[PDB]
Amino acid sequence: TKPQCRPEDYATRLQDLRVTFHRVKPTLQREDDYSVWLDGTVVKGCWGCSVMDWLLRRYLEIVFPAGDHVYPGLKTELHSMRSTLESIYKDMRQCPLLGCGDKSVISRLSQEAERKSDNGTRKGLSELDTLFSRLEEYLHSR
Amino acid sequence: TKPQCRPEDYATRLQDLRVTFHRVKPTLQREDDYSVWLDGTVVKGCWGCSVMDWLLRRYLEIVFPAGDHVYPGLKTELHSMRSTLESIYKDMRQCPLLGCGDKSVISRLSQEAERKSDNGTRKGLSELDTLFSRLEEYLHSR
Amino acid sequence: GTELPSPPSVWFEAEFFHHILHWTPIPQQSESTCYEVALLRYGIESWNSISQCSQTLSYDLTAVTLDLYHSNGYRARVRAVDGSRHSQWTVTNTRFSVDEVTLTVGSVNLEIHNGFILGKIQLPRPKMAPAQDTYESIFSHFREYEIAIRKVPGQFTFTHKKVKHEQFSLLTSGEVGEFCVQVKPSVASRSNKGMWSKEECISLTR
Amino acid sequence: GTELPSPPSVWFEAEFFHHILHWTPIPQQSESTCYEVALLRYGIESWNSISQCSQTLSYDLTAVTLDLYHSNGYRARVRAVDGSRHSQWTVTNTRFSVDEVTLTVGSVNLEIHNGFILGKIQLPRPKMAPAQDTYESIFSHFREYEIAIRKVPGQFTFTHKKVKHEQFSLLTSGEVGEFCVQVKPSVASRSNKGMWSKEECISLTRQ
C-alpha cells in the first residue's frame, strides 16, 4: 500500500498535538460556555470527508491565525500545533482513500474519455443509452 | 415532497430522450469500440450524487456540442436530447435531496461559528481536543 | 476465392428472456450453405461463435445472454459459410440491451364482484429467467398498461383506460352482457414497445 | 448573608470507568459543614446536583458519567454548605473527557515455557463499565506497554522493553533466578498518562 494512507503514520503527530494541547488546555478552556460545536457525527456519514477537509482548512487558515491575537501568550504553543496539523494535512491529501471518493471516479472517467483518439466524443454519444439508465437508476436511489 | 424532487417528474423526459436516441442509435453505436465507459457502479454509493452532476455537465457542456462536429446530419436529434437532458438537470438542482448532502453540515458549523462575538475563534481552540479525536476517528474509518 | 455474399442484415427481435437473432438470406443461397452466429458482450473485446453451421434464418441466443438485464449489452454478427468459403461478417447496428426488448404480458385474469370487474395482469415468467430476475425486478418502476375494453354484443370498437398497477378495476354500473379486454404493457420512462395480449372476456350474469 | 469560603480547587482524578472528583477543604471547616457536588455535560447548558451534602473530599461520579467515552466531556463544580449558608461554586478548569483518564492495567500474568517468559497483560475490567465499552473497545488502536524487568538476586535497577500487544515474551537464555516485571500502558497517538502496575515476579528454577 502507501504510507501516507496508513493511519499508523499519523499517530505521533496526533500525540504531539495532544501533548502541546494539554499544557495550555486550562487557558483555552476557561471562558468555555458548555456548548458543542464539533459534535459526534460532524465528520461521520457519507460526506464527512468533505467536512474533515473544510474543518482542517478552517483551522489552519482562520482559527489558528486568529488565535495569535486572542491568546498572545500561547503564540508559541499555537504555532507548534498549527505546524503539526499542517504536517498532517499535507500527508492526508496525498492519500485518495483519506479524502472523498468522488474525486477518484471522476478522475478515472475523464482519463479514458481522453486517451481516446477523439477525446471520447464517439464513446460518449454511443453510450447515451447507458447514461439514461444510470440517471434514472440514480433518481430512484435517493 | 416538492415536484422536482420525485422520480415521476422525470419519467416523460427520460422517455423522450430514449425514443429520440432510438432513431439515431444505429448511427451513433456504429463504431467498432465495444468497451464500457459508464460502468455499472459509476453512480452508485456515497460519491454518486457528485459523479452524476459531473456526467450531466460533461455531456451538456463538452460532448453534445462536440457532436454537431461529428454527426452533422443529426444536429436536430442531438439538439433535442441535449435540450431534454438540460431540462432535467436544472430541475434536479431545485431538489436538495437529489444532490450531495455535504453542504448542510458545513452550513451549520459556519453559521454557529459566525453567531459568536469573535467568530468562533474561542470556541474553536477550546475544542482542539475534540478535533483531534474526530480526526483520529476519521482516519480509522477510512 | 472465399468471397460469398454476406447476409444483407442482422438484428435482434426479443421479448423477456427470449432473445432471438434474425438475419436475411444471402442471394443465391445453396443447399450446402449455412450461417455462423457469433456473440460479443460489451466490456470484453472478443467474439465467440455460438453456432458454426446453422441452416436457419434465426438463432435463440437466450441461453447465452442471461445477464442482459444486468449487463451493458451485447453485439452480434452472422456470416455465411459454404464448405471452405465464407463472407465477411454482418454485425448488428446497435447495442442489444434491455432497451430493445419488447414488453409483453403473460395473461389477464378477470373476475366479477359486486358490480366490479377486477383484473389481474400476470407478467411473463419465462422458465429461462433466473429466479431473482423477474419482470418486476428488471422493470422496477413506472410499469403501465393500456386497457382496451369492448362489449361483445357491441362491436369491434374499443375504449381506452390507462393504469399504473398490475391490478385494475372497471365498474359494471348495472350493465349486462360480455366484456372483453386486451392489455398493452409499457414503462413510462422507457421507449420499449409493447404488444397487445390476447383478448380475455367474462360474462356478467345468468 | 451566606458567604462561606469556597473550596480552593476542584479536579478529577480518573482511571478507566473510575471517575473520581476531588476538592480541597475550605479553611475553618466546621463539623456541620458539607459539600454539594454538581455535574454538567457538554452540549446541554444545565447543572445537576449529584450530592447535596457530602461530608467528604471526594465523590465517585462514575455512575453518572458512563458515556464519557462517547461524549464531548463534562464539567464539575463543588460548593461548601453549612445549614443555610453556602459559598460560590468552584468549577473544574478543563473539560473532563477520555483524554484525562489515566491508563492502568488490571494485572500481568507471567509463565515459563522452554526458556521463555510468556506475559499476558489483563486490561482493567471495571464493573461499572457497560458490556461493550471495553478498554480495547475504547482505545482500539496503538495500545502500547513499557515493560520494566528486574532480576531479584540483582537489584533495584531496571531494563526497558516496549511492546505493542497485550501479550509479550522475554527469553530466559539459560538464566536462573527470579524475574520481576512491571507494566506501563499508553496509546501511541494519545497523551493520556499511565501508571506502573504492581510488580509481578516468577521463578525459573524450582523456586
Curated annotation (Swiss-Prot), chains A, B:
Belongs to the IL-10 family. It is found in: Secreted. The keyword Transport does not apply. Glycans are attached at N119. Disulfide bonds join C5-C95, C49-C100. Functional viral IL-10 homolog. Can bind to the human IL-10 receptor and compete with human IL-10 for binding sites. Requires both subunits of the human IL-10 receptor complex to induce signal transduction events and biological activities. IL-10 signaling pathway has several immunosuppressive activities that are exploited by the virus. Inhibits TLR-induced type I interferon production in host plasmacytoid dendritic cells. GO terms for molecular function: cytokine activity. GO terms for biological process: immune response; symbiont-mediated suppression of host dendritic cell mediated immune response; symbiont-mediated suppression of host innate immune response; symbiont-mediated suppression of host type I interferon-mediated signaling pathway. The chain holds residues 33 to 167 of 175 of the full protein. GO terms for cellular component: extracellular space. The lineage of its organism: Viruses, Duplodnaviria, Heunggongvirae, Peploviricota, Herviviricetes. Keywords: Cytokine, Disulfide bond, Evasion of host immunity by viral interleukin-like protein, Glycoprotein, Host-virus interaction, Inhibition of host innate immune response by virus, Inhibition of host interferon signaling pathway by virus, Interferon antiviral system evasion, Modulation of host dendritic cell activity by virus, Secreted, Signal, Viral immunoevasion. It comes from Human cytomegalovirus (strain AD169) (HHV-5). Homodimer; disulfide-linked. This is Viral interleukin-10 homolog.
Curated annotation (Swiss-Prot), chain C:
One of its GO terms (biological process) is ubiquitin-dependent endocytosis. One of its GO terms (molecular function) is signaling receptor activity. GO terms for cellular component: apical plasma membrane; cilium; cytosol; nucleoplasm; plasma membrane. It is found in: Cell membrane; Cytoplasm. Phosphorylated. Phosphorylation of the cytoplasmic tail induced STAT3 activation. It comes from the Eukaryota. Residues 1-206 are extracellular. The keyword ATP-binding does not apply. Disulfide bonds join C34-C53, C180-C201. Glycans are attached at Q28, Q52, Q88, Q132, Q155, Q167. Primarily expressed in hematopoetic cells including B-cells, T-cells, NK cells, monocytes and macrophages. Not expressed in non-hematopoetic cells such as fibroblasts or endothelial cells. Interacts with IL10. Interacts with IL10RB. Interacts (via its cytoplasmic domain) with JAK1 (via N-terminus). Interacts with BTRC; this interaction leads to IL10RA ubiquitination and subsequent degradation. Interacts with STAT3. (Microbial infection) Interacts with human cytomegalovirus protein IL10. Belongs to the type II cytokine receptor family. This is Interleukin-10 receptor subunit alpha. It comes from Homo sapiens.
